Design a protein around this ligand. Structure first.
Ligand SMILES: *[C@@](O)(C(=O)NCCCN1CCN(C)CC1)[C@H](CC)NC(=O)[C@H](CC(C)C)NC(=O)OCc1ccccc1
Ligand SMILES: [Ca+2]
Ligand SMILES: [Ca+2]
Ligand SMILES: [Cl-]
Ligand SMILES: [Cl-]
Ligand SMILES: [Cl-]
Length: 322
């Protein structure tokens, strides 16, 4: 069993709040500006001033912890520099086993609800259980930070809040390393690859990792500083964490082509080159392959050929488990 972060005991706190007729408020990460941040989200900042802390049960009549499963579409980035963390959460959802260690079963806004949730992280060399109250930063009734494409679903907002808590504040999450979040979800071994010096068998390495449920992420280095914009000519975002979510092969005019699928944790803004949702390449594959693989949706997720992938991206990170 996970040991309790700060000695806070989820089931005991929940049961005592229920008995006492109150909702949990977390002394260890309270609903005040110091939990938001210190500079950009400090007590005297423009961003801090508009934010009000509200529970999902104050926002909606029927809030849900999980709706139609805990999946990657549930990860839509808000106003914070935590793309690395969110890419890691999106990847985590592809492995049901490790997903449900991090996100314990049986949490809800219905029977037994007392305004407290918990998650498990690999921290301080231990598996630790971390509680949060469900007060969330909002503005005009909408979540400021991570949210689900399903507007009534809250597990990912709550997980991001627990991760903020262990790190001291939401602002503490701005700017980071995908591999760090990978490790914090698995206690696994991380490795990275320089895509400009990719091993000849890299695609097979990727296939194998995806098969075993390893976590994969990629990024494009900003080499000049930010000159050719944050966004590239083909609509990729530089200095930004993407989740790698699949690797599949297609028959393009009678010849195999290796493809790779990734997801922008914004839940929008995608590659517009070959193999993108609207590209001509799909016209020339097996109709079945097209129907199985292509999804015409602005959802942040898209395909590239492996060839284009290794040209456009610069870094690949893989976290391997047991
Ligand atoms: C990352 O790209 C990010 O979080 N961007 C925020 C985008 C804001 N969205 C835009 C869309 N709308 C709808 C919602 C708001 C982030 C920006 C800093 N990138 C990273 O953190 C980098 C990830 C790597 C995989 C490239 N890492 C990084 O910048 O490292 C810096 C660093 C390292 C150590 C300590 C501090 C900072
Ligand atoms: Ca969902
Ligand atoms: Ca898409
Ligand atoms: Cl407490
Ligand atoms: Cl304040
Ligand atoms: Cl629920």
């Amino acid at each position: 069993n996970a040991i309790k972060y700060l000695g806070q005991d989820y089931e005991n706190l929940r049961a005592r709040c229920l008995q006492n007729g109150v909702l949990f408020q977390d002394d260890a990460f309270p609903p005040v500006s110091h939990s938001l941040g210190f500079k950009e989200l400090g007590p005297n900042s423009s961003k801090t001033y508009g934010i009000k802390w509200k529970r999902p049960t104050e926002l909606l009549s029927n809030p849900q912890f999980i709706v139609d499963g805990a999946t990657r579409t549930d990860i839509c980035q808000g106003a914070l520099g935590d793309c690395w963390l969110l890419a890691a959460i999106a990847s985590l959802t592809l492995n049901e086993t490790i997903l449900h260690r991090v996100v314990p079963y049986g949490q809800s806004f219905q029977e037994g609800y007392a305004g407290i949730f918990h998650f498990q992280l690999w921290q301080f060399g231990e598996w630790v259980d971390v509680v949060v109250d469900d007060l969330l930063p909002t503005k005009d009734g909408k979540l400021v930070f991570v949210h689900s494409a399903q507007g009534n679903e809250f597990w990912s907002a709550l997980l991001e809040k627990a991760y903020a808590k262990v790190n001291g504040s939401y602002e503490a999450l701005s700017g980071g390393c995908t591999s760090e979040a990978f490790e914090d979800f698995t206690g696994g071994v991380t490795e990275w690859y320089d895509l400009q010096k990719a091993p000849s068998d890299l695609y097979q390495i990727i296939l194998k990792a995806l098969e075993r449920g390893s976590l994969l992420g990629c990024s494009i280095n900003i080499s000049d500083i930010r000159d050719l914009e944050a966004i590239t000519f083909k609509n990729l975002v530089r200095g930004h964490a993407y989740s790698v979510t699949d690797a599949k092969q297609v028959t393009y005019q009678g010849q195999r082509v290796n493809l790779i699928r990734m997801r922008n944790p914004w839940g929008e803004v995608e590659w517009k080159g070959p193999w993108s949702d609207n590209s001509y390449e799909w016209n020339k594959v097996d109709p079945y392959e097209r129907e199985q693989l292509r999804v015409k949706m602005e959802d942040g997720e898209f395909w590239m050929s492996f060839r284009d992938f290794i040209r456009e991206f610069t870094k690949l990170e893989i976290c391997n488990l047991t």
